[PDB]
Give the backbone structure.
Amino acid sequence: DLAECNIKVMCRFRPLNESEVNRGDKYIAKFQGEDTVVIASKPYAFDRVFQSSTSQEQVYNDCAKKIVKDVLEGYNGTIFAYGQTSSGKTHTMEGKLHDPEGMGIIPRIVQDIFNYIYSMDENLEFHIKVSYFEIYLDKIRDLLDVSKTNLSVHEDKNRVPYVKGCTERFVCSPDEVMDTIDEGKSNRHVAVTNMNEHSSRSHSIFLINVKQENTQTEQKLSGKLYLVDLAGSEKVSKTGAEGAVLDEAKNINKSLSALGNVISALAEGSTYVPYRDSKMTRILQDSLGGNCRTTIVICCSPSSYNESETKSTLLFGQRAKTI
Ligand SMILES: Nc1ncnc2c1ncn2[C@@H]1O[C@H](COP(=O)(O)OP(=O)(O)O)[C@@H](O)[C@H]1O
Ligand SMILES: [Mg+2]
């Protein structure tokens, strides 16, 4: 209702890696202005385009800073990291959790929430609760409690969605939150044979609920910020058991396609948005579109080898036609 589709898209290119250089790949991305990248002669503009040496600090200031303010202002928000595997999603969303320079968006957000709280501490009473869960094969598992598997989405008395039985943990300091993230990351290995395969094919969702009440004013505020590290958008090249010399069978991830439809619908100014297309979009319903701010950071390898995948990513990001 604020502006309808408050979706910003930033494209982040990472440096060519040693494997790409070793392979003999070339840097195909050309840049123009602070918002356009050129691939195969075709220009793609976005809210911003980050070249290969952009800092975690620049990404946070341009992509998340304002959203954090909105959450403290009492609004909901969502920030996504989209792209093929090895593009830079995790580096962007979390990076080095404890390195002041190398930390990603999540650490910097936590840092800013508490710092803000510390500068308040007068008449405002805060309460921060976090949740950490993953979506694999359109099934939800609690990363804070590995017994909570295949959870279901439900809507409460006031339409607000929630994951039935998902752990909600009250945190009181940045360190408590990082410990929570660290626990979730360790818990994730449970019942997973191949973590590489699993991580690239699943979605991590970290929720930060910031509630506050001014003891004097009495006006209460509550904001939810969902931080999402999506599954790899590259469906192609699925190796394994199937038609040996005859295969090309694999779809686009259910949640990614559901997200695509939701973003396109919002971009079109449609009154009906297809949130029900997936558990992910259903849970995110009260924080995606509407009167919520949303930043999607599409990450890309500048490699000649990943040219076609990059095109796809760029195209996905374009679903949110801005003006
Ligand atoms: N912006 C970057 N600067 C330096 N190294 C990067 C950059 N982005 C990604 N990498 C590195 O490339 C590797 C794969 O990136 P990662 O974020 O794990 O990929 P994914 O998109 O699969 O989550 C990691 O070591 C990561 O730190
Ligand atoms: Mg990853």
Summary: Residues 89-90, 199 surround magnesium ion (ligand 2) (CB under 6 Å). The domain at 1-323 is CATH 3.40.850.10 (Kinesin).
